[PDB]
Design a protein around this ligand. Structure first.
Ligand SMILES: Cc1cc2nc3c(=O)[nH]c(=O)nc-3n(C[C@H](O)[C@H](O)[C@H](O)COP(=O)(O)OP(=O)(O)OC[C@H]3O[C@@H](n4cnc5c(N)ncnc54)[C@H](O)[C@@H]3O)c2cc1C
Ligand SMILES: [Cl-]
Length: 486
C-alpha cells in the first residue's frame, strides 16, 4: 500500500503545494507532519514571530480537519523522530518542499540517508521560489548573477515561472487510527505560553494560509494600484494602511505561494499595458527575493563578513554602548526610535523605514557592524529571511551590491518629507504625543517651556541625541572612502 508523510518546514499552505499532491496521490494514509523542537528557546527568537508560526500551524490544522485529515506536530529532532515513525506507520514515500538554506541542506541530506535505509521514496519539488535556482546558475554559464539587471535579463530569457499547482482534493487520506506517535495529546498545536514565553505577542498581523489569501485579494482589489506599483515612491510613515502589501511574513513561512503571486500580477499586467517595470514594480520586488535567494545559495559564508567572497571587508567598530541605544529605541532621534519601536511591537516596518535604521547604525552614524544589526532583526522581524536579511543588510552597509556610501540618510529630514506632523512618531512614541510638530523631529531644539507644556523634557522623559549627525556622518563617510580605496 502507500502510506505517505508530507513534511512541513516552509510551505505552510495547501494551495500550490506540489509535494502535498504527490503525497496524497494513490495514498491509503497521509501523515501531515511538522517537526517542532521543544527546546528551541533554550539555545534569539521573539514571541511575535514564534506565535506567527503557531497561528500559521492552527490554520493548516483547521484546513486538514475540514478535509478529513489532521495535522501532526511532532516533538524532537527530525533525525531522531523520522526513523521511528517510518516503521511505525509503514511509510513508502516522503515529500517535503526543497530548501536552499545552509542548515536545511545539512538536515535534508541526513533525512535522505535515513529514508534510504527505511526504503522510503524522497520527493522534493521546488515551489518556495519562482524558478529552479540551480537552473538559473546553469543557464547563466555556471555562475550566479551579481546585478539585478543581469538577473532580470536571465529570467526573461528563461520565460514564465511554473504555474501554481492545483488545489488538493477535498477529501484527504486520513492517518491510520490507534498510532502511538500520532496521539492528539502529543501532536497538538501548542500555544505561546506552553512553549515557554512570558510576554504576549503585540503584532497586528495574524499568520495562516487563510490570512495570506485574504490579504492577497485585498491588494488586488485595485488593479490600478497593482500595475503602477513603484517601490521607492511608497510612504514609510503610513501605519494605519501600509503603503505596501506586507506579504513578506507569509512568503517567508510559505503561507503564500510566490508563483501564485506572480501569476496574479500577470493577469493585471495583461490588462494594464503601462504597468510598472522591474525592479520598482511589484513583480520586481518578487524578483529581488528570487535574486538574493540565487546568489546567497551559491555563495559561501553569505550571512557573515569574513570568508564572504562578495562582501567588502570593513573594520566595523565594536561599540556595545551605541548598539544598546539603537536596539532599545533610545538614540534621541524620534524618527529612528519610532521605527525600532515598531520593530519590537509589530515585527514589520516599511522597506524605507528599515533603510533609515540600518544606515544610521552602520555606514551612516554609529559605524557598528551590519552583522550586529542583523541579529537584532533576526529575532524581532516576523518576515525574517536568512538570504534576504543578509543581502539587504550588506546593501545598507555598502558592503555588497550597493556601493554609494556618499548617500547618507538624514535621521531628521527623511521622515519629515512624508510626515511633517509626526503621526508615525506619536503612535509608537506616545511620550511626544503633545510635542508641537515644529520640534517633534528635533526635541532637543524645543525651548524648555515648550518641553514642559508638551509633557516631554529631553533628558528626563526623552533621551538626548547620542550623536551629532553632521559630525558622525562626516566621519563615517571619510572612513568608507579610505576602505573603498582597497
Ligand atoms: C536591512 C533590511 C533587512 C531586510 N530583511 C528582510 C527580511 O528578513 N525578510 C524580508 O522578507 N525582507 C527583508 N527586507 C526587504 C524589505 O524591507 C521587505 O521585504 C519589505 O519591507 C516587505 O514589505 P512588503 O511585503 O509589503 O513588500 P512589497 O513591497 O509589497 O514586496 C512584495 C514582496 O517582495 C519581496 N521583497 C520586497 N522587497 C524586497 C527586497 N528589498 N529584497 C527582497 N525581497 C523583497 C518580499 O517577499 C515582499 O513580501 C529587508 C530590507 C532591509 C533594508
Ligand atoms: Cl534624507
Amino acid at each position: 500500500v502507500k502510506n505517505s508523510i508530507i513534511w512541513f518546514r516552509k510551505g505552510l499552505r495547501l494551495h500550490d503545494n506540489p509535494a502535498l499532491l504527490e503525497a496524497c496521490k494513490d495514498a491509503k494514509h497521509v501523515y501531515p507532519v511538522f517537526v517542532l523542537d521543544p527546546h528551541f528557546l533554550q539555545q534569539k527568537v521573539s514571541v511575535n514571530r514564534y506565535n506567527f508560526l503557531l497561528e500559521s500551524l492552527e490554520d493548516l490544522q483547521r484546513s486538514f480537519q475540514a478535509r478529513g485529515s489532521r495535522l501532526l506536530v511532532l516533538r524532537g529532532k527530525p533525525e531522531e523522530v523520522f526513523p521511528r515513525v517510518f516503521r511505525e506507520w509503514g511509510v513508502t514515500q516522503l515529500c517535503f518542499e526543497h530548501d536552499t538554506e545552509p542548515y536545511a541542506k545539512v538536515r535534508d541530506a541526513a533525512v535522505r540517508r535515513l529514508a534510504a535505509e527505511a526504503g522510503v521514496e524522497v520527493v522534493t519539488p521546488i515551489s518556495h521560489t519562482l524558478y529552479d535556482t540551480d537552473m538559473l546558475v546553469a543557464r547563466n554559464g555556471g555562475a550566479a548573477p551579481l546585478t539585478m539587471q543581469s538577473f532580470t535579463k536571465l529570467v526573461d530569457r528563461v520565460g514564465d515561472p511554473p504555474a501554481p499547482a492545483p488545489d488538493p482534493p477535498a477529501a484527504m487520506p486520513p492517518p491510520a487510527e490507534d498510532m502511538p506517535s500520532a496521539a492528539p495529546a502529543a501532536t497538538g498545536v501548542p500555544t505561546w505560553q506552553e512553549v515557554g514565553f512570558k510576554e504576549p505577542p503585540l503584532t497586528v498581523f495574524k499568520g495562516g494560509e487563510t490570512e495570506a489569501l485574504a490579504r492577497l485579494e485585498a491588494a488586488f482589489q485595485d488593479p490600478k494600484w497593482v500595475a503602477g506599483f513603484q517601490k521607492p515612491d511608497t510612504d514609510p510613515s503610513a501605519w494605519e494602511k501600509p503603503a505596501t502589501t506586507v506579504l513578506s511574513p507569509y512568503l517567508k513561512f510559505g503561507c503564500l505561494s510566490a508563483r501564485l503571486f506572480h501569476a496574479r500580477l500577470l493577469e493585471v499586467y495583461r490588462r494594464h499595458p503601462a504597468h510598472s517595470q522591474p525592479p520598482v514594480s511589484l513583480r520586481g520586488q518578487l524578483l529581488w527575493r528570487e535574486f538574493f535567494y540565487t546568489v546567497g545559495s551559491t555563495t559561501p559564508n553569505f550571512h557573515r563578513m569574513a570568508g564572504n567572497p562578495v562582501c567588502k571587508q570593513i573594520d566595523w567598530d565594536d561599540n556595545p554602548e551605541f548598539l544598546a541605544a539603537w536596539r532599545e529605541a533610545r538614540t534621541g532621534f524620534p524618527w529612528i526610535d519610532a521605527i525600532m519601536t515598531q520593530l519590537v511591537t509589530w515585527g514589520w516596518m516599511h522597506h524605507l523605514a528599515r533603510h533609515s535604521v540600518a544606515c544610521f547604525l552602520t555606514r551612516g552614524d554609529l559605524y557598528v557592524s551590519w552583522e550586529r544589526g542583523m541579529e537584532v532583526f533576526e529575532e524581532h522581524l516576523i518576515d525574517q529571511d536568512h538570504y534576504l536579511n543578509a543581502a539587504n543588510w550588506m546593501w545598507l552597509s555598502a558592503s555588497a551590491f550597493f556601493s554609494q556610501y556618499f548617500r547618507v540618510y538624514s535621521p531628521v529630514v527623511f521622515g519629515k518629507k512624508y510626515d511633517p506632523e509626526g503621526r508615525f512618531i506619536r503612535k509608537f512614541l506616545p511620550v511626544l504625543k503633545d510635542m508641537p510638530a515644529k520640534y517633534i523631529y528635533e526635541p532637543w531644539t524645543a525651548p524648555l517651556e515648550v518641553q514642559r507644556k508638551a509633557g516631554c523634557v529631553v533628558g528626563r522623559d526623552y533621551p538626548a541625541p547620542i550623536v551629532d549627525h553632521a559630525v558622525a556622518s562626516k566621519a563615517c563617510i571619510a572612513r568608507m572612502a579610505a576602505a573603498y580605496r582597497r
